[PDB]
Amino acid sequence: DLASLAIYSFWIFLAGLIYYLQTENMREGYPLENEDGTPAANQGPFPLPKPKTFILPHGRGTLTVPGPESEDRPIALARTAVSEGFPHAPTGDPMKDGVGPASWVARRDLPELDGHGHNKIKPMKAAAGFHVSAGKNPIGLPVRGCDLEIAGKVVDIWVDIPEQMARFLEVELKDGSTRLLPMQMVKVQSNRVHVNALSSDLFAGIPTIKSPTEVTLLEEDKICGYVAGGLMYAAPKR
Amino acid sequence: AEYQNIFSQVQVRGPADLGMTEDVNLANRSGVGPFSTLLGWFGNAQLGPIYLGSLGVLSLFSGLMWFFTIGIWFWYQAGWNPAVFLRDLFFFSLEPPAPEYGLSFAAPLKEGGLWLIASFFMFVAVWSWWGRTYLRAQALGMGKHTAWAFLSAIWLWMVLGFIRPILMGSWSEAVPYGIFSHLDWTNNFSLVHGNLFYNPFHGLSIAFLYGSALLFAMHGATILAVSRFGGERELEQIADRGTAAERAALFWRWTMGFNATMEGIHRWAIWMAVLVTLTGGIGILLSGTVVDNWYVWGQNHG
Amino acid sequence: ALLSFERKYRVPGGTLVGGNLFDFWVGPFYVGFFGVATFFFAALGIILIAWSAVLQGTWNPQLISVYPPALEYGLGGAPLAKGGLWQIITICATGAFVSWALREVEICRKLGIGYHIPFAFAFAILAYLTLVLFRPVMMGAWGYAFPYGIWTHLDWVSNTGYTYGNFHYNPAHMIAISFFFTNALALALHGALVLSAANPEKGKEMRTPDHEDTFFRDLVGYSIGTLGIHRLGLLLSLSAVFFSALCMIITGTIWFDQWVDWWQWWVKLPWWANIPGGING
Ligand code: BCL
Ligand code: BCL
Numbered sequence: 001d002l003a004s005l006a007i008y009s010f011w012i013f014l015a016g017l018i019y020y021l022q023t024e025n026m027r028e029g030y031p032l033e034n035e036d037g038t039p040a041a042n043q044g045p046f047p048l049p050k051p052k053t054f055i056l057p058h059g060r061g062t063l064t065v066p067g068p069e070s071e072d073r074p075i076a077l078a079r080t081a082v083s084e085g086f087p088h089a090p091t092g093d094p095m096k097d098g099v100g101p102a103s104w105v106a107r108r109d110l111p112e113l114d115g116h117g118h119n120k121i122k123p124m125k126a127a128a129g130f131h132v133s134a135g136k137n138p139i140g141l142p143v144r145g146c147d148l149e150i151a152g153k154v155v156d157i158w159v160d161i162p163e164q165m166a167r168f169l170e171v172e173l174k175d176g177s178t179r180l181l182p183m184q185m186v187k188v189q190s191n192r193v194h195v196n197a198l199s200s201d202l203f204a205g206i207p208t209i210k211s212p213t214e215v216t217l218l219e220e221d222k223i224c225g226y227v228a229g230g231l232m233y234a235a236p237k238r
Numbered sequence: 239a240e241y242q243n244i245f246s247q248v249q250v251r252g253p254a255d256l257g258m259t260e261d262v263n264l265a266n267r268s269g270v271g272p273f274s275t276l277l278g279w280f281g282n283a284q285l286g287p288i289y290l291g292s293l294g295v296l297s298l299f300s301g302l303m304w305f306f307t308i309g310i311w312f313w314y315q316a317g318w319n320p321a322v323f324l325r326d327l328f329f330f331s332l333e334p335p336a337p338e339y340g341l342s343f344a345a346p347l348k349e350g351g352l353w354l355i356a357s358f359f360m361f362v363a364v365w366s367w368w369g370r371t372y373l374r375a376q377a378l379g380m381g382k383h384t385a386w387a388f389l390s391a392i393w394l395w396m397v398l399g400f401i402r403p404i405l406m407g408s409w410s411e412a413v414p415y416g417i418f419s420h421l422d423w424t425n426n427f428s429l430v431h432g433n434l435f436y437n438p439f440h441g442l443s444i445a446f447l448y449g450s451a452l453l454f455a456m457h458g459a460t461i462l463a464v465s466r467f468g469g470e471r472e473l474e475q476i477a478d479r480g481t482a483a484e485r486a487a488l489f490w491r492w493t494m495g496f497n498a499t500m501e502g503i504h505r506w507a508i509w510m511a512v513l514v515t516l517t518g519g520i521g522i523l524l525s526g527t528v529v530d531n532w533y534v535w536g537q538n539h540g
Numbered sequence: 541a542l543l544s545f546e547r548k549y550r551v552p553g554g555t556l557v558g559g560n561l562f563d564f565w566v567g568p569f570y571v572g573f574f575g576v577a578t579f580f581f582a583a584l585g586i587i588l589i590a591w592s593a594v595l596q597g598t599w600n601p602q603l604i605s606v607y608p609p610a611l612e613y614g615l616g617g618a619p620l621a622k623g624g625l626w627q628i629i630t631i632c633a634t635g636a637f638v639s640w641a642l643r644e645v646e647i648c649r650k651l652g653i654g655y656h657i658p659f660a661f662a663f664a665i666l667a668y669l670t671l672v673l674f675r676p677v678m679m680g681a682w683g684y685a686f687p688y689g690i691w692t693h694l695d696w697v698s699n700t701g702y703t704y705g706n707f708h709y710n711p712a713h714m715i716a717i718s719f720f721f722t723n724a725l726a727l728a729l730h731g732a733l734v735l736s737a738a739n740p741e742k743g744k745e746m747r748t749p750d751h752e753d754t755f756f757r758d759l760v761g762y763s764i765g766t767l768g769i770h771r772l773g774l775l776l777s778l779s780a781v782f783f784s785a786l787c788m789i790i791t792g793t794i795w796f797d798q799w800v801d802w803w804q805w806w807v808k809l810p811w812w813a814n815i816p817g818g819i820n821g
């Protein structure tokens with residue numbers, strides 16, 4: 001009777017899907033690259049899909065995935081043990097080198113672009129008429145670090161346009177030079193902001209702009225990443 | 239402590255990114271809306287406009303001719319009384335038209351025959367609405383991924399709103415409009431069939447209403463944690479994966495055994511859910527014409 | 541045994557207890573201190589999933605099901621026959637969730653991202669606790685709890701629930717329920733959207749984080765944006781539970797008579813109690 005069938009003719013649309021799914025889910029990351037960077041031993045009872053053609057925004061090229069997933073750069077980790085798995089100690093400076101918690105990426109040297117056309121990530125001092133409607137406007141807040149010291153004031157706010165939302169803060173350091181901070185990693189209060197991740201002196205190493213009015217996705221990683229990394233190695237001072 | 243990105247410490251604003259254009263007909267988009275300075279601490283603070291179309295109308299419109307029948311039968315029982323319409327508002331119940339009639343369009347008004355003229359407007363509101371999720375998906379140029387998953391819900395609905403009750407010939411084996419009236423309709427259904435935990439479509443349909451709970455409730459736990467790294471906007475990650483998308487799947491492989499990409503994760507749960515109104519949709523289409531009882535099948539399996 | 545970009549992260553330091561000790565991997569699996577805890581405990585669990593499964597007779601999981609200290613006993617210990625196990629195990633089965641999470645932290649320590657997960661878990665974590673540690677020790681004796689059975693617990697609810705008339709009438713349920721349905725509709729549009737605009741009509745250009753929003757504003761008349769929804773998700777979810785781990789920590793410790801009865805706190809209010817007409821006058 002139809003009863004029996006329907007419940008099995010469906011463990012089909014179920015396992016036959018567990019597939020169709022975990023398939024698509026292997027375009028970025030696999031095949032595995034051993035403890036060196038060479039194809040490894042047992043490579044999952046799963047194949048690799050039929051790479052598809054993406055049609056990027058505004059003819060700014062195209063991406064086909066999966067595909068030549070090259071590690072477009074170097075690394076400063078040199079194994080402290082003999083067998084598979086184990087940790088890989090940093091060479092010198094983990095942050096600058098761009099590793100571990102501070103790790104950054106190999107993404108295009110360009111700024112996101114809204115559907116309209118213009119740069120997509122902009123600075124308030126240049127937004128097309130942007131007043132801060134409510135909240136605690138930091139433009140002028142003496143941002144402090146974690147090891148207790150002054151390091152810079154808020155001089156502007158960076159927003160995403162059609163996603164009108166606070167994304168970044170420019171802050172002039174000890175030498176009148178502009179740095180950029182990850183909204184999503186700071187704390188405004190009554191009068192003083194606070195960066196839980198890093199400290200006074202470590203603001204120095206913060207990678208910086210290459211045009212304080214347009215910032216690329218690429219650069220974003222570098223900084224964001226860096227900032228992160230500091231939650232671990234910039235803690236003997238906080 | 240710190241900043242659990244649940245509330246953007248700050249809000250801002252500009253005009254209103256009206257949106258795109260493509261081939262859309264804007265001689266039909268209207269005026270914007272105010273700016274709830276609260277709806278902001280979360281998503282956008284912006285509001286409006288919308289597409290008032292050939293279908294914009296028909297949809298909502300006939301969508302009213304429905305709730306103004308569940309506002310016509312409660313302004314009858316309550317005895318045109320403003321106090322009863324409140325007290326015994328819930329209990330109010332317009333059940334279907336008895337087994338006697340059956341498959342007839344000749345049911346007297348008062349007794350059940352006002353349930354018909356009520357359902358009718360309902361259909362013309364969902365398949366006049368579902369039908370619109372397309373056009374919007376089209377004038378924009380987006381896969382029917384949306385319009386599709388809707389059908390999903392319609393499923394469970396169609397089964398319990400016209401489907402099952404045609405192979406039953408009893409307009410009275412459907413659900414009534416009223417707060418509690420249907421709540422019992424369900425309980426009084428787990429029963430005229432036996433026990434419904436014994437149903438791998440409620441032993442599975444159920445299953446799904448759990449992942450779409452754990453899963454979705456993992457994507458936030460996920461996505462958010464790494465906002466600090468371009469976590470948010472998911473789009474320009476598929477087309478360029480960053481420490482964002484990376485560190486992401488990275489936690490799960492070092493945790494559950496594997497992971498998904500950026501594009502993937504979505505196609506993940508997307509089905510996860512649709513499968514609840516689908517398994518359900520089925521789950522019930524059987525009870526009443528292929529299994530006159532279910533504790534039966536718990537022992538039998540044939 | 542590694543993803544193309546897993547290399548550039550595997551770094552020492554990151555334990556809450558131990559140090560560089562219980563700090564290393566296992567193929568694509570990580571360990572940590574609670575990597576051993578999520579084991580020593582968990583297993584000591586299946587050690588008792590066999591032992592109490594045998595003194596039961598059969599081995600088919602459609603039946604196996606150690607039971608809770610029967611409604612008698614009380615709050616005291618218990619002979620390893622009925623309950624004695626169900627308990628000792630309840631403790632170890634729980635102890636692996638403690639670790640399951642604490643292990644999920646060293647995993648948020650190394651990547652240092654947000655902690656949005658080892659938290660979201662603690663909601664399901666309690667969803668459990670309450671239904672075994674709390675709710676029961678507050679009504680009377682463990683017993684009330686559920687059977688760690690596969691078809692037995694399904695009858696643990698079918699039961700207790702009806703113990704108070706229909707159950708839908710539980711306001712802490714029905715409203716903990718909606719915050720469960722919707723969540724799915726949530727996922728329901730988030731994927732069918734974000735995706736619908738990633739593999740748009742065959743041909744044309746990939747769409748944008750713009751178009752997205754526009755869709756609904758063109759439909760509903762709004763958009764909780766992007767970063768918006770991705771909270772709506774999390775929360776909408778976490779809630780439903782919190783609202784449920786409640787409609788239970790209640791049914792019995794403060795409310796006994798049938799739930800459906802409570803719905804009179806309303807229908808029998810001063811300014812319209814007597815009044816003729818309707819379905820109660
Ligand atoms: C919430 C209120 C009730 C309850 C009510 C119900 C109801 C009602 C139903 C279930 C059903 C299920 N319940 Mg339950 N269940 C409860 C508590 C639990 C606990 C616990 C530790 O407290 C566990 C492990 C389970 C587990 C399960 C699954 C075996 C099954 C659902 C599949 C699914 O998609 O799940 C959702 C989870 C996911 C999508 C995540 C992945 C997790 C997987 C599914 C877990 C597999 C566990 C495996 C079968 C058991 C291994 C144990 C061995 C000793 C190692 N329940 C509480 C007490 N449960 C359904 C069924 O029909 O089952 C036959 C069903 O209809
Ligand atoms: C005594 C009662 C029985 C029982 C009887 C039933 C019965 C009977 C049914 C279910 C069904 C379901 N049950 Mg049950 N169920 C029980 C116990 C449980 C338990 C539990 C832990 O005990 C769980 C987890 C579940 C879970 C579930 C779900 C898996 C499933 C419903 C899916 C859904 O969300 O549809 C919700 C989504 C929709 C309805 C989508 C359709 C949307 C429509 C078209 C939109 C209308 C819009 C409106 C006009 C617009 C308003 C907006 C205006 C602005 C105002 N049941 C008990 C034991 N259950 C259903 C199923 O499918 O089962 C297989 C079902 O028929």
Ligand code: BCL
Nearest residue numbers: 398399413417420421424708713714715717718719721722
């Ligand atoms: C799927 C299995 C069962 C079932 C099981 C349950 C269970 C279990 C529960 C409900 C609950 C509800 N059910 Mg039901 N329900 C079924 C079939 C139906 C049908 C129908 C035409 O077939 C309708 C109209 C309803 C309607 C309703 C609501 C009155 C109420 C949920 C509020 C909510 O979550 O809003 C979400 C709303 C939004 C996101 C938008 C804004 C909405 C405004 C405030 C609400 C207008 C609501 C409109 C009148 C009801 C729409 C719900 C429909 C399911 C689509 N059910 C089937 C037969 N239903 C819940 C309750 O509280 O019951 C007492 C509850 O716990």
Ligand code: BCL
Nearest residue numbers: 664665667668697698701702707708716717720784785788
């Ligand atoms: C006659 C029966 C009653 C009834 C009685 C009850 C009762 C009694 C209870 C519920 C509860 C619930 N009911 Mg009910 N319910 C009824 C009808 C319905 C209907 C309907 C349409 O009729 C619906 C939608 C629901 C819906 C719901 C849910 C909102 C809620 C359970 C979710 C939860 O808390 O999970 C909580 C999640 C957990 C406990 C799991 C946590 C996961 C753990 C930590 C992980 C384990 C991992 C495992 C060991 C590993 C396996 C390894 C494998 C490799 C995977 N009920 C009927 C009317 N319902 C429950 C509730 O609210 O509980 C608080 C509850 O107790």
Ligand SMILES: CC[C@H]1c2cc3[nH]c4c(c3C)C(=O)[C@H](C(=O)OC)c4c3nc(cc4[nH]c(cc(n2)[C@@H]1C)c(C(C)=O)c4C)[C@@H](C)[C@@H]3CCC(=O)OC/C=C(\C)CCC[C@H](C)CCC[C@H](C)CCCC(C)C
Nearest residue numbers: 298301305363364367387388391511512721722724725728
């Ligand atoms: C896997 C299935 C999941 C799912 C999916 C789902 N739901 C969907 C879709 C999908 C894919 C849609 O595309 C569709 C949608 O358009 O969503 C935005 C929808 C939808 N899901 C809805 C509800 C819903 N879905 C639920 C669940 C689920 N939906 C599942 C979890 C539930 C619960 C809690 O169980 C509910 C209540 C609807 C809101 C919407 C479909 C709308 C519809 O069918 O409309 C017909 C039209 C009417 C009834 C119009 C009358 C409206 C009011 C009476 C008028 C008052 C308000 C008005 C604003 C006044 C204006 C006055 C003027 C003067 C300005």
Ligand SMILES: CC[C@H]1c2cc3[nH]c4c(c3C)C(=O)[C@H](C(=O)OC)c4c3nc(cc4[nH]c(cc(n2)[C@@H]1C)c(C(C)=O)c4C)[C@@H](C)[C@@H]3CCC(=O)OC/C=C(\C)CCC[C@H](C)CCC[C@H](C)CCCC(C)C
Nearest residue numbers: 448451452582585586633640660661663664689690777778
């Ligand atoms: C808002 C809360 C939502 C949620 C969240 C959630 N769940 C989570 C997480 C989060 C944030 C995790 O990080 C964790 C995870 O790793 O997910 C991939 C997890 C998880 N959610 C899980 C399950 C789960 N979540 C559920 C629900 C939910 N999870 C909610 C919807 C459900 C339901 C409702 O059915 C289930 C079954 C696990 C698969 C996983 C955690 C896995 C884990 O901790 O594994 C190590 C544990 C062991 C090896 C345990 C062995 C123990 C002994 C052998 C005995 C077993 C005793 C048990 C009492 C038996 C029960 C038998 C049943 C038949 C009754």
Ligand SMILES: [Fe+3]
Nearest residue numbers: 457461472730
């Ligand atoms: Fe998402």
Ligand SMILES: [Mn+2]
Nearest residue numbers: 116117118119
């Ligand atoms: Mn221009």
